[PDB]
Design a protein around this ligand. Sequence first.
Ligand SMILES: NC[C@H]1O[C@H](O[C@H]2[C@H](O)[C@@H](O[C@H]3O[C@H](CO)[C@@H](O)[C@H](N)[C@H]3O)[C@H](N)C[C@@H]2N)[C@H](N)C[C@@H]1O
Ligand SMILES: Nc1ncnc2c1ncn2[C@@H]1O[C@H](COP(=O)(O)CP(=O)(O)OP(=O)(O)O)[C@@H](O)[C@H]1O
Ligand SMILES: [Mn+2]
Ligand SMILES: [Mn+2]
Length: 176
Amino acid sequence: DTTQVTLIHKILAAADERNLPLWIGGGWAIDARLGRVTRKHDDIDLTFPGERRGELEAIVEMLGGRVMEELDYGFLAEIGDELLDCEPAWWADEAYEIAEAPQGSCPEAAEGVIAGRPVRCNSWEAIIWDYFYYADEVPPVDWPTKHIESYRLACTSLGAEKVEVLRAAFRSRYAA
Ligand SMILES: NC[C@H]1O[C@H](O[C@H]2[C@H](O)[C@@H](O[C@H]3O[C@H](CO)[C@@H](O)[C@H](N)[C@H]3O)[C@H](N)C[C@@H]2N)[C@H](N)C[C@@H]1O
Ligand SMILES: Nc1ncnc2c1ncn2[C@@H]1O[C@H](COP(=O)(O)CP(=O)(O)OP(=O)(O)O)[C@@H](O)[C@H]1O
Ligand SMILES: [Mn+2]
Ligand SMILES: [Mn+2]
């Protein structure tokens, strides 16, 4: 909705002012890379420089929100009725990287668009990688249609063959 889109704009405007890079992830990242809103989104997934967490928290608080909960992978924040699902990325040689994700997870270039404005967003590979973790908890056939359709859309955008090679790499990484 306009509330989320406006909120995304406000968060990134504030981050830009501090030269704080933030990467849109998850469902909004798919829509950003496509340059098209495809459905309603339940939250906003964000990736932030882990060593600058305080700056993202300060922006959340500046916008009238609060940190709500710590997660195994990051933290949960709330601005009004909108949920922000935040994960750190850590400096790895010459770029920020999400822990355990494929290299290039956090490109410096803005490769997506939301409401006409370029935005940084996680790579297709990083977006798809998180579905592999999900598949390991819940069989894909048992996913809500939301997740099935989002997955298939991301898959088609990147290329099915690239996805199946990536999935083989995931299986190899976590094989036991
Ligand atoms: N990078 C390593 C991590 O990757 C994945 O986490 C991913 C989480 O599963 C993602 O969170 C998802 O799962 C959580 C519940 O775990 C939901 O609350 C949330 N809305 C949903 O988006 C979150 N938004 C991104 C994160 N990369 C793995 N599930 C855990 C792993 O430690
Ligand atoms: N219980 C769970 N365990 C692990 N990964 C999960 C998960 N639930 C969701 N995920 C993964 O997290 C990513 C997206 O998470 P969610 O934010 O909950 C939905 P989404 O694709 O962002 O749509 P949305 O825009 O409506 O939020 C996908 O990779 C999905 O597979
Ligand atoms: Mn989401
Ligand atoms: Mn989420």
